[PDB]
Write a protein that binds this DNA or RNA. Structure first.
Ligand SMILES: [Mg+2]
Ligand SMILES: [Mg+2]
Ligand SMILES: [Mg+2]
Ligand SMILES: [Mg+2]
Ligand SMILES: [Mg+2]
Ligand SMILES: [Mg+2]
Ligand SMILES: [Mg+2]
Ligand SMILES: [Mg+2]
Ligand SMILES: [Mg+2]
Ligand SMILES: [Mg+2]
Ligand SMILES: [Mg+2]
Ligand SMILES: [Mg+2]
Ligand SMILES: [Mg+2]
Ligand SMILES: [Mg+2]
Ligand SMILES: [Mg+2]
Ligand SMILES: [Mg+2]
Ligand SMILES: [Mg+2]
Ligand SMILES: [Mg+2]
Ligand SMILES: [Mg+2]
Ligand SMILES: [Mg+2]
Ligand SMILES: [Mg+2]
Ligand SMILES: [Mg+2]
Ligand SMILES: [Mg+2]
Ligand SMILES: [Mg+2]
Ligand SMILES: [Mg+2]
Ligand SMILES: [Mg+2]
Ligand SMILES: [Mg+2]
Ligand SMILES: [Mg+2]
Ligand SMILES: [Mg+2]
Ligand SMILES: [Mg+2]
Ligand SMILES: [Mg+2]
Ligand SMILES: [Mg+2]
Ligand SMILES: [Mg+2]
Ligand SMILES: [Mg+2]
Ligand SMILES: [Mg+2]
Ligand SMILES: [Mg+2]
Ligand SMILES: [Mg+2]
Ligand SMILES: [Mg+2]
Ligand SMILES: [Mg+2]
Ligand SMILES: [Mg+2]
Ligand SMILES: [Mg+2]
Ligand SMILES: [Mg+2]
Ligand SMILES: [Mg+2]
Ligand SMILES: [Mg+2]
Ligand SMILES: [Mg+2]
Ligand SMILES: [Mg+2]
Ligand SMILES: [Mg+2]
Ligand SMILES: [Mg+2]
Ligand SMILES: [Mg+2]
Ligand SMILES: [Mg+2]
Ligand SMILES: [Mg+2]
Ligand SMILES: [Mg+2]
Ligand SMILES: [Mg+2]
Ligand SMILES: [Mg+2]
Ligand SMILES: [Mg+2]
Ligand SMILES: [Mg+2]
Ligand SMILES: [Mg+2]
Ligand SMILES: [Mg+2]
Ligand SMILES: [Mg+2]
Ligand SMILES: [Mg+2]
Ligand SMILES: [Mg+2]
Ligand SMILES: [Mg+2]
Ligand SMILES: [Mg+2]
Ligand SMILES: [Mg+2]
Ligand SMILES: [Mg+2]
Ligand SMILES: [Mg+2]
Ligand SMILES: [Mg+2]
Ligand SMILES: [Mg+2]
Ligand SMILES: [Mg+2]
Ligand SMILES: [Mg+2]
Ligand SMILES: [Mg+2]
Ligand SMILES: [Mg+2]
Ligand SMILES: [Mg+2]
Ligand SMILES: [Mg+2]
Ligand SMILES: [Mg+2]
Ligand SMILES: [Mg+2]
Ligand SMILES: [Mg+2]
Ligand SMILES: [Mg+2]
Ligand SMILES: [Mg+2]
Ligand SMILES: [Mg+2]
Ligand SMILES: [Mg+2]
Ligand SMILES: [Mg+2]
Ligand SMILES: [Mg+2]
Ligand SMILES: [Mg+2]
Ligand SMILES: [Mg+2]
Ligand SMILES: [Mg+2]
Ligand SMILES: [Mg+2]
Ligand SMILES: [Mg+2]
Ligand SMILES: [Mg+2]
Ligand SMILES: [Mg+2]
Ligand SMILES: [Mg+2]
Ligand SMILES: [Mg+2]
Ligand SMILES: [Mg+2]
Ligand SMILES: [Mg+2]
Ligand SMILES: [Mg+2]
Ligand SMILES: [Mg+2]
Ligand SMILES: [Mg+2]
Ligand SMILES: [Mg+2]
Ligand SMILES: [Mg+2]
Ligand SMILES: [Mg+2]
Ligand SMILES: [Mg+2]
Ligand SMILES: [Mg+2]
Ligand SMILES: [Mg+2]
Ligand SMILES: [Mg+2]
Ligand SMILES: [Mg+2]
Ligand SMILES: [Mg+2]
Ligand SMILES: [Mg+2]
Ligand SMILES: [Mg+2]
Ligand SMILES: [Mg+2]
Ligand SMILES: [Mg+2]
Ligand SMILES: [Mg+2]
Ligand SMILES: [Mg+2]
Ligand SMILES: [Mg+2]
Ligand SMILES: [Mg+2]
Ligand SMILES: [Mg+2]
Ligand SMILES: [Mg+2]
Ligand SMILES: [Mg+2]
Ligand SMILES: [Mg+2]
Ligand SMILES: [Mg+2]
Ligand SMILES: [Mg+2]
Ligand SMILES: [Mg+2]
Ligand SMILES: [Mg+2]
Ligand SMILES: [Mg+2]
Ligand SMILES: [Mg+2]
Ligand SMILES: [Mg+2]
Ligand SMILES: [Mg+2]
Ligand SMILES: [Mg+2]
Ligand SMILES: [Mg+2]
Ligand SMILES: [Mg+2]
Ligand SMILES: [Mg+2]
Ligand SMILES: [Mg+2]
Ligand SMILES: [Mg+2]
Ligand SMILES: [Mg+2]
Ligand SMILES: [Mg+2]
Ligand SMILES: [Mg+2]
Ligand SMILES: [Mg+2]
Ligand SMILES: [Mg+2]
Ligand SMILES: [Mg+2]
Ligand SMILES: [Mg+2]
Ligand SMILES: [Mg+2]
Ligand SMILES: [Mg+2]
Ligand SMILES: [Mg+2]
Ligand SMILES: [Mg+2]
Ligand SMILES: [Mg+2]
Ligand SMILES: [Mg+2]
Ligand SMILES: [Mg+2]
Ligand SMILES: [Mg+2]
Ligand SMILES: [Mg+2]
Ligand SMILES: [Mg+2]
Ligand SMILES: [Mg+2]
Ligand SMILES: [Mg+2]
Ligand SMILES: [Mg+2]
Ligand SMILES: [Mg+2]
Ligand SMILES: [Mg+2]
Ligand SMILES: [Mg+2]
Ligand SMILES: [Mg+2]
Ligand SMILES: [Mg+2]
Ligand SMILES: [Mg+2]
Ligand SMILES: [Mg+2]
Ligand SMILES: [Mg+2]
Ligand SMILES: [Mg+2]
Ligand SMILES: [Mg+2]
Ligand SMILES: [Mg+2]
Ligand SMILES: [Mg+2]
Ligand SMILES: [Mg+2]
Ligand SMILES: [Mg+2]
Ligand SMILES: [Mg+2]
Ligand SMILES: [Mg+2]
Ligand SMILES: [Mg+2]
Ligand SMILES: [Mg+2]
Ligand SMILES: [Mg+2]
Ligand SMILES: [Mg+2]
Ligand SMILES: [Mg+2]
Ligand SMILES: [Mg+2]
Ligand SMILES: [Mg+2]
Ligand SMILES: [Mg+2]
Ligand SMILES: [Mg+2]
Ligand SMILES: [Mg+2]
Ligand SMILES: [Mg+2]
Ligand SMILES: [Mg+2]
Ligand SMILES: [Mg+2]
Ligand SMILES: [Mg+2]
Ligand SMILES: [Mg+2]
Ligand SMILES: [Mg+2]
Ligand SMILES: [Mg+2]
Ligand SMILES: [Mg+2]
Ligand SMILES: [Mg+2]
Ligand SMILES: [Mg+2]
Ligand SMILES: [Mg+2]
Ligand SMILES: [Mg+2]
Ligand SMILES: [Mg+2]
Ligand SMILES: [Mg+2]
Ligand SMILES: [Mg+2]
Ligand SMILES: [Mg+2]
Ligand SMILES: [Mg+2]
Ligand SMILES: [Zn+2]
Lengths: 53, 64
RNA sequence: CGGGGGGAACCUGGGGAACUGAAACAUCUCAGUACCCAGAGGAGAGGAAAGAGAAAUCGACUCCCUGAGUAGCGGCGAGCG
RNA sequence: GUGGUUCGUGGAGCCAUGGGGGAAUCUGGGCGGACCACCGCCUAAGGCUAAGUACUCCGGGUGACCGAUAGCGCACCAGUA
RNA sequence: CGUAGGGAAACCGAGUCCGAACAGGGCGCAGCGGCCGCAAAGUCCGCGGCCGUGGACCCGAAACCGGG
RNA sequence: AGCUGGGGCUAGGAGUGAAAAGCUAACCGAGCCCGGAGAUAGCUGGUUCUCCCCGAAAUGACUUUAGGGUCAGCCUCAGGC
RNA sequence: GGUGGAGCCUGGGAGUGAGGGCGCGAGCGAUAACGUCCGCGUCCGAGCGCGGGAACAACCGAGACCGCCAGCUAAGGCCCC
RNA sequence: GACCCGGUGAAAUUGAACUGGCCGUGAAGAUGCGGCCUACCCGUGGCAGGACGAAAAGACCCCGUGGAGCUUUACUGCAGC
RNA sequence: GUGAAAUACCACCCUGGCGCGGCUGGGGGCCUAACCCUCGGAUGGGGGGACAGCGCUUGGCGGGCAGUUUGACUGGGGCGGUCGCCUCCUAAAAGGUAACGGAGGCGCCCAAAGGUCCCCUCAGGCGGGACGGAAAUCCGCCGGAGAGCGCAAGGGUAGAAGGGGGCCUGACUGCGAGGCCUGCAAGCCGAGCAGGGGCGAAAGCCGGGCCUAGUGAACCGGUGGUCCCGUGUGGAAGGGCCA
């Protein structure tokens, strides 16, 4: 990673719990990530949103 | 004078009932974002220490 | 009427290092030990709860055993306790 | 601002106090580990106090302690030459 | 000290911890002859080797510090 | 700016110094004595009777580590298979 | 197949972690070094005990429990020492 | 002075000595191993070539996570302002 | 009449601004008696003057002194160079194997350059064609791979790991038999079970990337979550577990 190849987390938009940790390239993806992952808390897949790490 | 229990160990490790040394798994304190889920998952568990090193870490625990 | 000075260590108060250990070293340790000073005595200090701390309990202080290298303290290092 | 306590600022109370501000007398005040409340313990800012405890210049008893390069530095005119 | 362990802990307990799990895995769980005797976990004192703490196998520094 | 007797004062991180780090009781880049003290020494040395069986290593990894150490390797002893 | 101071397992005690010559395979070196750095092996180390090599730790021979004024052999040797 | 006689009589040094030379060898500079040459036993005055002669646990050099003095815009503290 | 709010009048509050009083903070000026210096005389005179000096405290300058640090490898030390990870060789046809031996790279990157389904096959040589070229793109024959795979090198690879596109987020959670490697600790591969999903008609594949580097153990602390402990009790301070 670098200053452009940042770090970030995913937040189960339903219960707002952060679940996964990944990265992106804020120049090639300056839009906040929105990915559909699985929440062990809700116990069902859910759209997760890039929050800041 | 009697021996002093080494606390650097009693805070990290734990002697079982059969005479083994079980310490938590090293690696997942930080720098974990790009690590696997398998790598974070497996490292959250104890591991029996090598016999030679455990033997030493028990002579430091003379009273447990 | 009393004090002054002496006494081998032992005692309490006022001050108080370092080598060393941490396999370097500064916090830390060695340790409030060694040493200096004032004082006291056959002993000195402490001592009759504005305490301890969870028993709805104990009952001044001193010393030994035990509690225990437990609780905790610690560049949670060496180690302290 | 420090010292003591296992407590090295730690969530840091308790005991002590060099600096500042500065009360009350039982309807008082300190305490039970920051703080608030409930519940409890105690009753500071005057003092005294035997024994059980520590040491061994001194005297005595006794040793699977030494026996003149040993045992105190000195078994003898030694803290001497 | 031992008779119960597992867990950071509440806490459960021949099981317990991660877990949604009746899944999977970690650390755990069970004497010999003819009642007897014999053996043993464990524990206690001796002895022995080794380790920790202290000058710790003996002698040796250059140096630091304190009071005179 | 001389030499000199006698009486004096200044000292240990301190004194003096027409300056050499010279001098401070015959060795001064921090005097001497005594104490902390048996400082520390991963370095060198030294380690005392006899016989009996086995019998090495000087490699690898990490090591402010390289002439020192932790684990493994190679030796040994007791028990078990 | 192999019953060997063979091997597996648990446990206690170590020492070693400065190797060196030779032979073969390489690198480095100059197709130098009693040079250096690795690999398989061997020997000295620990066999500086014995025979040969004039003499010589490691080349050839050969693994020394002790005693004999007995015999056979290995390397190497048989004109004299 | 040295040297001879009477009188007194030290010293560092010293594994033990029955202590030759040459060509070789050997931890690479042999009185001590091998071969050869030489050499009768003990002395006194002398000369300094060798016993890698004596003395001082190399001032040089590196090593030690040794020390100490000096230095600064090295780190961290203290006096002082 | 009128606007959202409406008028005489009587309070409580604001806007701002003015004077008295409060109580303080700065600045100016002057006293004096604390405090300090001085005066043959001292319960006093004289000058300084609430500053200075001193005490607790803040922050700075501070080799003046004090305690220490100032790495190792090295064909002696120093100067130079190097220090972990990856690829090839040396490496003597298993693995492993040194040297300040010979050659080069990593400290990133991709939201697609991931997953799945379907389809497609390259460089290169010869001839062919406006602008138009030794190589822009089209047509034809030959072309088992010499192209390509983001980057060093290697091995691998079209019967895909290469190129196009569709729907997608498995770049999952909870574990994980058995193993490679191995001194420790680490690092590596991983079938399968459940939870919930994605691509597919289906068999099936998917726990990021054709692979091998792209990294950093504990200690200390930050943020979200959990709701386990809470120092007499209920909470809180502060912690532990998860990420
Ligand atoms: Mg992840
Ligand atoms: Mg436990
Ligand atoms: Mg961890
Ligand atoms: Mg964490
Ligand atoms: Mg990765
Ligand atoms: Mg994963
Ligand atoms: Mg988990
Ligand atoms: Mg206990
Ligand atoms: Mg127990
Ligand atoms: Mg007296
Ligand atoms: Mg005191
Ligand atoms: Mg002092
Ligand atoms: Mg010190
Ligand atoms: Mg010491
Ligand atoms: Mg130590
Ligand atoms: Mg000590
Ligand atoms: Mg030290
Ligand atoms: Mg040390
Ligand atoms: Mg030092
Ligand atoms: Mg102390
Ligand atoms: Mg005292
Ligand atoms: Mg006196
Ligand atoms: Mg007295
Ligand atoms: Mg008495
Ligand atoms: Mg009294
Ligand atoms: Mg009273
Ligand atoms: Mg106890
Ligand atoms: Mg106990
Ligand atoms: Mg720690
Ligand atoms: Mg202490
Ligand atoms: Mg303190
Ligand atoms: Mg703090
Ligand atoms: Mg404190
Ligand atoms: Mg307390
Ligand atoms: Mg006060
Ligand atoms: Mg009351
Ligand atoms: Mg009150
Ligand atoms: Mg109080
Ligand atoms: Mg209070
Ligand atoms: Mg309170
Ligand atoms: Mg209390
Ligand atoms: Mg409380
Ligand atoms: Mg009350
Ligand atoms: Mg109380
Ligand atoms: Mg009172
Ligand atoms: Mg009293
Ligand atoms: Mg008395
Ligand atoms: Mg008494
Ligand atoms: Mg007596
Ligand atoms: Mg006798
Ligand atoms: Mg006797
Ligand atoms: Mg005598
Ligand atoms: Mg005597
Ligand atoms: Mg006699
Ligand atoms: Mg289980
Ligand atoms: Mg099991
Ligand atoms: Mg029995
Ligand atoms: Mg016993
Ligand atoms: Mg041992
Ligand atoms: Mg000691
Ligand atoms: Mg000793
Ligand atoms: Mg000595
Ligand atoms: Mg000494
Ligand atoms: Mg010093
Ligand atoms: Mg000094
Ligand atoms: Mg004079
Ligand atoms: Mg004079
Ligand atoms: Mg005089
Ligand atoms: Mg003086
Ligand atoms: Mg001095
Ligand atoms: Mg002194
Ligand atoms: Mg002094
Ligand atoms: Mg001076
Ligand atoms: Mg003197
Ligand atoms: Mg002198
Ligand atoms: Mg000095
Ligand atoms: Mg002198
Ligand atoms: Mg003294
Ligand atoms: Mg000491
Ligand atoms: Mg030292
Ligand atoms: Mg003898
Ligand atoms: Mg080695
Ligand atoms: Mg290691
Ligand atoms: Mg290091
Ligand atoms: Mg070296
Ligand atoms: Mg070992
Ligand atoms: Mg056996
Ligand atoms: Mg056998
Ligand atoms: Mg054997
Ligand atoms: Mg063997
Ligand atoms: Mg063994
Ligand atoms: Mg070594
Ligand atoms: Mg060597
Ligand atoms: Mg050695
Ligand atoms: Mg070596
Ligand atoms: Mg070698
Ligand atoms: Mg060699
Ligand atoms: Mg030779
Ligand atoms: Mg050779
Ligand atoms: Mg041949
Ligand atoms: Mg050859
Ligand atoms: Mg060769
Ligand atoms: Mg080579
Ligand atoms: Mg050669
Ligand atoms: Mg060499
Ligand atoms: Mg070597
Ligand atoms: Mg040797
Ligand atoms: Mg031989
Ligand atoms: Mg042999
Ligand atoms: Mg031989
Ligand atoms: Mg011999
Ligand atoms: Mg010999
Ligand atoms: Mg021979
Ligand atoms: Mg011979
Ligand atoms: Mg011969
Ligand atoms: Mg044989
Ligand atoms: Mg014959
Ligand atoms: Mg012949
Ligand atoms: Mg002859
Ligand atoms: Mg004559
Ligand atoms: Mg004469
Ligand atoms: Mg000799
Ligand atoms: Mg002769
Ligand atoms: Mg030669
Ligand atoms: Mg010669
Ligand atoms: Mg000869
Ligand atoms: Mg001769
Ligand atoms: Mg001879
Ligand atoms: Mg000869
Ligand atoms: Mg002569
Ligand atoms: Mg000469
Ligand atoms: Mg001569
Ligand atoms: Mg002469
Ligand atoms: Mg000579
Ligand atoms: Mg000679
Ligand atoms: Mg000479
Ligand atoms: Mg000399
Ligand atoms: Mg010398
Ligand atoms: Mg020497
Ligand atoms: Mg020496
Ligand atoms: Mg020397
Ligand atoms: Mg030297
Ligand atoms: Mg040095
Ligand atoms: Mg160093
Ligand atoms: Mg070193
Ligand atoms: Mg220095
Ligand atoms: Mg001053
Ligand atoms: Mg000034
Ligand atoms: Mg004025
Ligand atoms: Mg003022
Ligand atoms: Mg004053
Ligand atoms: Mg200050
Ligand atoms: Mg200076
Ligand atoms: Mg400075
Ligand atoms: Mg100084
Ligand atoms: Mg300094
Ligand atoms: Mg020091
Ligand atoms: Mg070096
Ligand atoms: Mg290295
Ligand atoms: Mg060099
Ligand atoms: Mg050289
Ligand atoms: Mg060399
Ligand atoms: Mg080399
Ligand atoms: Mg350099
Ligand atoms: Mg290979
Ligand atoms: Mg090979
Ligand atoms: Mg292998
Ligand atoms: Mg290099
Ligand atoms: Mg790729
Ligand atoms: Mg054209
Ligand atoms: Mg290719
Ligand atoms: Mg590239
Ligand atoms: Mg190929
Ligand atoms: Mg594709
Ligand atoms: Mg696609
Ligand atoms: Mg869909
Ligand atoms: Mg496994
Ligand atoms: Mg492993
Ligand atoms: Mg990794
Ligand atoms: Mg499924
Ligand atoms: Mg499915
Ligand atoms: Mg479908
Ligand atoms: Mg899978
Ligand atoms: Mg990759
Ligand atoms: Mg792909
Ligand atoms: Mg790294
Ligand atoms: Mg640390
Ligand atoms: Mg839970
Ligand atoms: Mg509470
Ligand atoms: Mg709770
Ligand atoms: Mg309430
Ligand atoms: Mg609340
Ligand atoms: Mg909280
Ligand atoms: Mg929390
Ligand atoms: Mg975590
Ligand atoms: Zn959720």
């Amino acid at each position: 990673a670098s200053e452009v190849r940042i770090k970030l987390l995913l937040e189960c938009t339903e219960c707002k719990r952060r679940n996964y940790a990944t990265e992106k390239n804020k120049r090639n993806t300056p839009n906040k990530l929105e990915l559909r992952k699985y929440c062990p808390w809700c116990r069902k897949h859910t759209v997760h949103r890039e929050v800041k790490i | 004078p009697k021996m002093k229990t080494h606390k650097g160990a009693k805070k990290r490790v734990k002697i079982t009932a059969s005479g083994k040394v079980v310490a938590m798994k090293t690696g997942k304190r930080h720098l974990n974002w790009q690590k696997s889920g398998k790598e974070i998952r497996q490292k959250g568990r104890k591991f029996v220490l090598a016999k030679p090193e455990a033997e030493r870490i028990k002579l430091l625990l003379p009273y447990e």
